[PDB]
Design a protein around this motif. Sequence first.
Motif, PDB file in Angstrom:
ATOM      1  N   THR A   5      39.241  31.772  44.017  1.00 18.09           N
ATOM      2  CA  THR A   5      39.122  33.226  44.083  1.00 18.09           C
ATOM      3  C   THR A   5      40.136  33.856  43.139  1.00 18.09           C
ATOM      4  O   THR A   5      41.342  33.748  43.370  1.00 18.09           O
ATOM      5  CB  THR A   5      39.345  33.702  45.518  1.00 18.09           C
ATOM      6  OG1 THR A   5      38.352  33.090  46.354  1.00 18.09           O
ATOM      7  CG2 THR A   5      39.229  35.208  45.618  1.00 18.09           C
ATOM      8  N   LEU A   6      39.655  34.538  42.092  1.00 21.80           N
ATOM      9  CA  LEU A   6      40.521  35.244  41.145  1.00 21.80           C
ATOM     10  C   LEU A   6      40.522  36.740  41.417  1.00 21.80           C
ATOM     11  O   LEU A   6      39.472  37.345  41.666  1.00 21.80           O
ATOM     12  CB  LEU A   6      40.072  35.023  39.702  1.00 21.80           C
ATOM     13  CG  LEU A   6      40.522  33.813  38.897  1.00 21.80           C
ATOM     14  CD1 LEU A   6      40.322  32.535  39.659  1.00 21.80           C
ATOM     15  CD2 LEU A   6      39.695  33.785  37.607  1.00 21.80           C
ATOM     16  N   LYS A   7      41.707  37.336  41.368  1.00 20.79           N
ATOM     17  CA  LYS A   7      41.862  38.776  41.508  1.00 20.79           C
ATOM     18  C   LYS A   7      42.668  39.309  40.332  1.00 20.79           C
ATOM     19  O   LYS A   7      43.616  38.656  39.872  1.00 20.79           O
ATOM     20  CB  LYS A   7      42.556  39.162  42.843  1.00 20.79           C
ATOM     21  CG  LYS A   7      41.892  38.534  44.049  1.00 20.79           C
ATOM     22  CD  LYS A   7      42.062  39.371  45.322  1.00 20.79           C
ATOM     23  CE  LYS A   7      41.554  38.582  46.519  1.00 20.79           C
ATOM     24  NZ  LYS A   7      41.457  39.437  47.766  1.00 20.79           N
ATOM     25  N   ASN A  29      32.488  37.424  38.804  1.00 19.31           N
ATOM     26  CA  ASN A  29      33.069  36.750  39.962  1.00 19.31           C
ATOM     27  C   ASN A  29      34.496  37.198  40.291  1.00 19.31           C
ATOM     28  O   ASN A  29      35.105  36.661  41.222  1.00 19.31           O
ATOM     29  CB  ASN A  29      33.049  35.236  39.733  1.00 19.31           C
ATOM     30  CG  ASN A  29      32.553  34.474  40.941  1.00 19.31           C
ATOM     31  OD1 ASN A  29      32.760  34.896  42.082  1.00 19.31           O
ATOM     32  ND2 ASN A  29      31.886  33.346  40.699  1.00 19.31           N
ATOM     33  N   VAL A  30      35.039  38.152  39.589  1.00 19.37           N
ATOM     34  CA  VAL A  30      36.443  38.505  39.740  1.00 19.37           C
ATOM     35  C   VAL A  30      36.561  39.786  40.560  1.00 19.37           C
ATOM     36  O   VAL A  30      35.786  40.724  40.366  1.00 19.37           O
ATOM     37  CB  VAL A  30      37.081  38.650  38.350  1.00 19.37           C
ATOM     38  CG1 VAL A  30      38.523  39.112  38.476  1.00 19.37           C
ATOM     39  CG2 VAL A  30      36.942  37.322  37.578  1.00 19.37           C
ATOM     40  N   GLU A  31      37.533  39.834  41.472  1.00 24.07           N
ATOM     41  CA  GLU A  31      37.800  41.041  42.242  1.00 24.07           C
ATOM     42  C   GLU A  31      38.883  41.852  41.547  1.00 24.07           C
ATOM     43  O   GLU A  31      39.918  41.303  41.161  1.00 24.07           O
ATOM     44  CB  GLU A  31      38.235  40.715  43.672  1.00 24.07           C
ATOM     45  CG  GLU A  31      38.590  41.980  44.470  1.00 24.07           C
ATOM     46  CD  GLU A  31      39.110  41.714  45.881  1.00 24.07           C
ATOM     47  OE1 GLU A  31      39.066  40.557  46.350  1.00 24.07           O
ATOM     48  OE2 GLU A  31      39.555  42.685  46.528  1.00 24.07           O
ATOM     49  N   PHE A  32      38.631  43.145  41.372  1.00 20.62           N
ATOM     50  CA  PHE A  32      39.573  44.059  40.733  1.00 20.62           C
ATOM     51  C   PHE A  32      40.209  44.953  41.785  1.00 20.62           C
ATOM     52  O   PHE A  32      39.499  45.520  42.625  1.00 20.62           O
ATOM     53  CB  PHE A  32      38.858  44.909  39.674  1.00 20.62           C
ATOM     54  CG  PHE A  32      38.317  44.095  38.531  1.00 20.62           C
ATOM     55  CD1 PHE A  32      39.128  43.786  37.443  1.00 20.62           C
ATOM     56  CD2 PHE A  32      37.010  43.617  38.552  1.00 20.62           C
ATOM     57  CE1 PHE A  32      38.649  43.022  36.409  1.00 20.62           C
ATOM     58  CE2 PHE A  32      36.524  42.845  37.509  1.00 20.62           C
ATOM     59  CZ  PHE A  32      37.350  42.552  36.439  1.00 20.62           C
ATOM     60  N   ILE A  33      41.535  45.107  41.706  1.00 16.56           N
ATOM     61  CA  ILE A  33      42.310  45.935  42.624  1.00 16.56           C
ATOM     62  C   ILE A  33      43.118  46.909  41.773  1.00 16.56           C
ATOM     63  O   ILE A  33      43.762  46.497  40.798  1.00 16.56           O
ATOM     64  CB  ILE A  33      43.260  45.083  43.494  1.00 16.56           C
ATOM     65  CG1 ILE A  33      42.482  44.022  44.286  1.00 16.56           C
ATOM     66  CG2 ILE A  33      44.136  45.970  44.396  1.00 16.56           C
ATOM     67  CD1 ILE A  33      43.386  42.997  44.956  1.00 16.56           C
ATOM     68  N   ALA A  88      43.292  35.276  47.784  1.00 13.23           N
ATOM     69  CA  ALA A  88      43.383  34.955  46.364  1.00 13.23           C
ATOM     70  C   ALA A  88      43.932  33.558  46.143  1.00 13.23           C
ATOM     71  O   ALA A  88      44.890  33.133  46.795  1.00 13.23           O
ATOM     72  CB  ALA A  88      44.276  35.960  45.650  1.00 13.23           C
ATOM     73  N   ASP A  89      43.329  32.852  45.190  1.00  8.66           N
ATOM     74  CA  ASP A  89      43.881  31.603  44.682  1.00  8.66           C
ATOM     75  C   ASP A  89      44.654  31.821  43.401  1.00  8.66           C
ATOM     76  O   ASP A  89      45.636  31.105  43.140  1.00  8.66           O
ATOM     77  CB  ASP A  89      42.756  30.593  44.460  1.00  8.66           C
ATOM     78  CG  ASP A  89      42.037  30.257  45.757  1.00  8.66           C
ATOM     79  OD1 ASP A  89      42.733  29.994  46.760  1.00  8.66           O
ATOM     80  OD2 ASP A  89      40.793  30.282  45.779  1.00  8.66           O
ATOM     81  N   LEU A 119      48.476  31.379  42.545  1.00 10.04           N
ATOM     82  CA  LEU A 119      48.956  31.233  41.179  1.00 10.04           C
ATOM     83  C   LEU A 119      49.045  32.618  40.571  1.00 10.04           C
ATOM     84  O   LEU A 119      48.019  33.291  40.453  1.00 10.04           O
ATOM     85  CB  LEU A 119      47.993  30.359  40.386  1.00 10.04           C
ATOM     86  CG  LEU A 119      48.429  30.116  38.947  1.00 10.04           C
ATOM     87  CD1 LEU A 119      49.723  29.290  38.901  1.00 10.04           C
ATOM     88  CD2 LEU A 119      47.327  29.412  38.129  1.00 10.04           C
ATOM     89  N   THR A 120      50.250  33.065  40.205  1.00  8.14           N
ATOM     90  CA  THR A 120      50.461  34.464  39.830  1.00  8.14           C
ATOM     91  C   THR A 120      50.826  34.596  38.354  1.00  8.14           C
ATOM     92  O   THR A 120      51.893  34.150  37.930  1.00  8.14           O
ATOM     93  CB  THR A 120      51.534  35.091  40.722  1.00  8.14           C
ATOM     94  OG1 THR A 120      51.110  34.978  42.086  1.00  8.14           O
ATOM     95  CG2 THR A 120      51.706  36.573  40.425  1.00  8.14           C
TER      96      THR A 120
END
Length: 307
Positions: A5-7, A29-33, A88-89, A119-120
């Motif tokens: 899961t990528l954000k 596939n990416v979540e945006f915040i 989030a991964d 992973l940041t």
Amino acid sequence: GHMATLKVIGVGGGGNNAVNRMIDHGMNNVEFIAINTDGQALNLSKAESKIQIGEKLTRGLGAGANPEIGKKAAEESREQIEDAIQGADMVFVTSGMGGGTGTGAAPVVAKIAKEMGALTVGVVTRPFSFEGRKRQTQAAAGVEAMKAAVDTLIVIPNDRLLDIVDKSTPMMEAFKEADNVLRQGVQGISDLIAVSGEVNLDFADVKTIMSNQGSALMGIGVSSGENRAVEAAKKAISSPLLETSIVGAQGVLMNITGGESLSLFEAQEAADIVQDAADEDVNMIFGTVINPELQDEIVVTVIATGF
Ligand SMILES: Nc1nc2c(ncn2[C@@H]2O[C@H](COP(=O)(O)OP(=O)(O)O)[C@@H](O)[C@H]2O)c(=O)[nH]1
Ligand SMILES: NC(=O)c1c(F)ccc(OCc2cccc(C(F)(F)F)c2)c1F
Ligand SMILES: [K+]
């Protein structure tokens, strides 16, 4: 079948601008915040998830170029930030350093994501020299706080945009070149996760190369014709926009994608181009994808870390 899961999290004005322009590309596939103090700007965000931080502190305004207010605002809203990051991964935290909200809140957001085991990766700009020494000094303190809070950091000095424009290039067109640093990195990781390679790399390889590893480069090069592998690899490691060059890299995740014509020799040539800059003891993780839809195009992608 692990589906990471990528954000992507924009923090402050510049960070949310970059997120808005990436959303206009419809990345799937990416979540945006979107995180901001500035309620006016936040209301115009295209991100699915919006977090207004610091409302009691700023009354809904921005931080007024005060990083201490940006930091306090993120701390006031720690629980809402945690809630948004949950699951989030991998988190990309993107922000423009030098103002109040990005400078102060982006390291808090990054710390929370890393505390939750994601992973940041930070992707931040430094201000233009024409914005003044004071803003540059404020931004450099933000950069250092980000380094302390992330696994890996990509720094885009805005002054580098002045190396790729002519006197008439629209400001917004220049900003899209900086946005593309973030977009290609996010998209490239997304491709790595989704596609099965002939030599397959996956999110655990990304974690080995990027976890707790300092400065980073994330590049892509596309070429065709004669010398395509050398030219594509040179492009992947030679962006005019990065602070950190690949000289001295201690970790490299590299992938080559081509059609059925992709030769073993040109895989070696591309790898040698990347090796001839990295440290002799570089941990290299090399992958290959054969995409028969491609004809003469070759795509080289590089993550380089460890300086
Ligand atoms: N490349 C680029 N840089 C930006 C953009 N917006 C702001 N900046 C830079 O980011 C720094 C901080 O601005 P901003 O994000 O608006 O401040 P904040 O909202 O208080 O965090 C500025 O000093 C500029 O150097 C943008 O859209 N693109
Ligand atoms: N061999 C694979 O499984 C694979 C795959 F099937 C698709 C893409 C792959 O790598 C993409 C990539 C690599 C480094 C840097 C980047 C970025 F662009 F983010 F910098 C992207 C792969 F390794
Ligand atoms: K893969």
